Design a protein around this ligand. Structure first.
Ligand code: Z5G
Ligand code: Z5G
Lengths: 455, 564
């Protein structure tokens, strides 16, 4: 699988010609050591005083050239290694963002952060070390073998100062050739990790089949929403979900319902392959992933706040449109300004300490404030998992109602009172909808009354 | 770090003496190379003819000794490094459990365990390479320098002048490298946290956001890390050449007056060549000895693993006793209040019978699962005494209390190594492989592991193997069975409702339920039906426990049974 690794280095053939020069000069020095040792024998035998006294300059020059070659070769191998690991890390992160997010369910965050970081370092370290040692090995072996073949010709039968030079140049093969038989160890160690990252380097991908920029419709119509849980069994049976613009409809489901799974289909998450979502001649890929994500803003019950400055969390989805007046209006709309402004100054709160500054209620209020400030054409409200009782429970409920009244919203039945206050209520049990129309008919039938009393 | 690391191979006194001899005899041969070339020069200069017979035998014997010494030394240092790393892994595995409730609860051990294992493996590689290099190169350098002293004692200016400057230069370089490694580690932590909080926050980034902002933030952090690393490796790859040049300059200087005219070393012409050669033999080993500085000091700096266990309090387990199989972990009038939050369980006196199946019925995220998991030091529980088997649980040691209890969690029990190491017990010698395999054969997960690759003949536990949630849950169940703990806690929500091995999983669970007491929280109707006795708790408090017939008779419990 190492073949594709060369493509990531193909940017760097301009600098890869310097490491060859460096290790070539290193090999030249490690061959010329034999030249020097042969030189001294003849100098002593013939008592050639001039070069004999000149010898220390030869030693210093040889070691300096060896050092320069090793320095530049090693540094440029390091540059290749670091730039390669940076490029691989950036590309794998870019792809890992796009993936359809079912990978996130079964694969925990710990495994992903272990992979994307340690695995790539292991791969690049093994590859760089193997390449460095194989280049050094090959070039020194070529130089020394040429030096041997220059004098004593053949050596296959076994397998004055000139004799000394030959035996030295033959002995020098010892450590390089020992590296030769050891490269495969590092290569296989790198192989053990390469498949883990390179397989994820493609690992399928989510795309924008519709490829339509315009998505300011505000109307959603879903027909026969049937999804099979990992192709083993249907999560929810067929149901018709037609939502008119502006109007808000409340959805109530029994135990085992898709709930967040059903809503996520409307947000281009876990797209329903078995479905008939067609509104105003728009297919399942109505506009695009980015367009459908921007036009519809959800309020997740999990409520996750990034460990960054409050400036970053205030305008995550609207970076250019970051306005102080808009942020103030959002803080007024949802009763969260007091919680943010109590501990820090407020303009730049800089949330930190692993979220210890703000409690869970303040975090939920901040999430609701961000959802309100999104002001998307369509919103999905889901707060069932949140605690019913809170210090600012009434304020949070009022903020949620104000956000729902802004545009079209389909509730996830966070509270029984909220569902009752909703004008339109639709109930689907086990994937089958038995309640429809005005809430007066449902109240008269009392079908949802028992569920509300139980919950 | 060195002081504590030394005490980890010190008890292995027997294996220590048998690794040094190989590198010592290697150094002896390497030194004898100079004596050999001294032999050759005077053999060629004079009319000696027996050299034609001496030389091949001497070369063959030297090669044989070098090969034998290197092989023996490498194998023995490999086994020593492996044993040391196994000891580190055993110590961290024992001490991973019971490090405060907040530390385990907040991080959920999903990333902490991975970070710890990564640090341990980095220390593994660094220690192995550094130890091999330091021992071999030190022995060869000391032996060769001893030869230098023996050959010409009066030549001592090489020790003088330059060598202290070389030493202080090396120390300064090491200090500067540590300074750069500090910033490298800082950027490492920053980018790690950015990536982790991006992973946990995919819902927000896809709901109302664009990936480009997060991509730019990650790009900035990664480029800063790149620049710091390039500066660090500038320092690294520049350290060795300059020290090589300065020491070689010192050697040339001492040779110059050692080769001064009208002395010529009394015109020996054989000893001087041997000395020059032996001095040249220093080049590569000393270069390796300088280069190992980076690896060793990077390992030391990354050795925060040796510090994580050094900082841990344990005061509750002051009973100085281990009840082992208590048989009943019960709490009377147990009420625990979270910090800056309402109490999850109030006026709860739940008790666990010996060997009786117990389950918790409640909504997702309710207090039932929290109360069930509260047995293993989930909360301080300062208010409200809890006594198990008519004795407070603080008497038992924290390690003993944790080990005696068993929990089912695929994420927590997931070793990033081969499946054989995945079911590794407390001790290597305590648990025989054959018995563990036979016991785990009841779980019927042996076929699932064997179908993908071969854990016995090849490394297992890859991404594909870990992606199977059912396989991971079955492996954890098998490990718990091999533990033979008195109390077992399991979650049926993680397990797939419908699967090919669902019937086998249900049969294995039914078989295991009779063996030992289970307080497993069951989210599946199959386990509820298999449960003879069920505990129903509302808002963290259980009014009473009734049988299946009693639950069916009561309308409120019948509705819950019909729902799930
Ligand atoms: O003669 C040998 N090796 C030499 S001679 C010399 C040097 C070396 C070396 O170890 O690189 C270093 C530079 C100065 C002169 C040798 C001969 C036979 C074997 Cl079976 C192994 C080694
Ligand atoms: O003595 C050293 N280097 C020499 S002197 C010499 C030679 C070499 C060599 O590079 O092998 C080759 C044969 C002729 C004379 C030396 C000593 C200490 C260090 Cl830290 C590094 C190098």
């Amino acid at each position: 699988v190492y073949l594709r690794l060369i493509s990531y280095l193909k940017p760097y053939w301009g600098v890869a010609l310097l490491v060859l020069i460096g290790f070539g000069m290193n090999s030249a020095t490690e061959v010329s050591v034999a030249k020097l040792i042969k030189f001294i024998i003849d100098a002593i035998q013939n008592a050639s005083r001039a070069d004999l006294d000149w010898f220390p300059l030869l030693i210093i020059l040889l070691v300096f050239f060896r050092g320069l070659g090793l320095f530049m070769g090693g540094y440029y191998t390091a540059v290749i290694s670091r730039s390669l690991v940076f490029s691989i890390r950036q590309e794998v992160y870019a792809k890992l963002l796009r993936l359809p997010a079912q990978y996130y369910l079964d694969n925990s965050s710990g495994h992903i952060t272990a992979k994307i970081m340690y695995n790539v370092e292991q791969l690049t370290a093994a590859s760089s070390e193997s390449l460095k040692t194989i280049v050094r090995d090959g070039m020194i072996t070529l130089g020394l073998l040429g030096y041997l073949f220059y004098t004593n010709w053949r050596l296959t039968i076994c397998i004055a100062g000139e004799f000394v030079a030959y035996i030295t140049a033959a002995g020098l093969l010892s450590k390089p050739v020992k590296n030769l038989t050891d490269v495969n160890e590092k290569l296989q160690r790198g192989l053990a990790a390469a498949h883990s990252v390179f397989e994820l380097l493609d690992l399928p991908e989510e795309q924008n089949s519709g490829e339509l920029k315009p998505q300011l419709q505000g109307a959603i119509r879903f027909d026969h929403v049937v999804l099979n849980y990992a192709d083993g069994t249907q999560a929810i049976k067929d149901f018709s979900l037609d939502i008119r613009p502006g109007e808000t409809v409340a959805l109530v489901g029994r135990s085992g319902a898709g709930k967040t799974s059903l809503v996520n289909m409307l947000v281009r998450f876990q797209e329903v392959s078995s479905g008939q979502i067609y509104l105003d001649d728009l297919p399942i890929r109505d506009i695009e992933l980015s367009s459908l994500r921007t036009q519809i803003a959800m309020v997740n019950q999990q409520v996750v706040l990034f460990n960054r400055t409050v400036r970053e969390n205030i305008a995550y989805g609207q970076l250019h449109n970051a306005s102080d007046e808009d942020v103030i209006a959002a803080a007024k709309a949802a009763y969260a300004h007091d919680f943010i402004m109590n501990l820090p100054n407020g303009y730049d709160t800089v949330l930190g300490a692993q979220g210890l500054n703000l409690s869970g209620g303040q975090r939920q209020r901040i999430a609701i404030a961000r959802a309100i400030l999104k002001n998307a054409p369509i919103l999905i409200l889901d707060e069932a998992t949140s605690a019913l009782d809170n210090e600012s429970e009434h304020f949070i409920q009022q903020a949620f109602d104000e956000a729902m009244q802004d545009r079209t919203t389909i509730v996830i039945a966070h509270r029984l009172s909220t569902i009752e206050n909703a004008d339109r209520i639709v109930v689907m049990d086990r994937g089958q909808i038995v309640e429809q129309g005005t809430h007066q008919e449902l109240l008269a039938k009392h079908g949802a009354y028992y569920q509300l009393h139980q919950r």
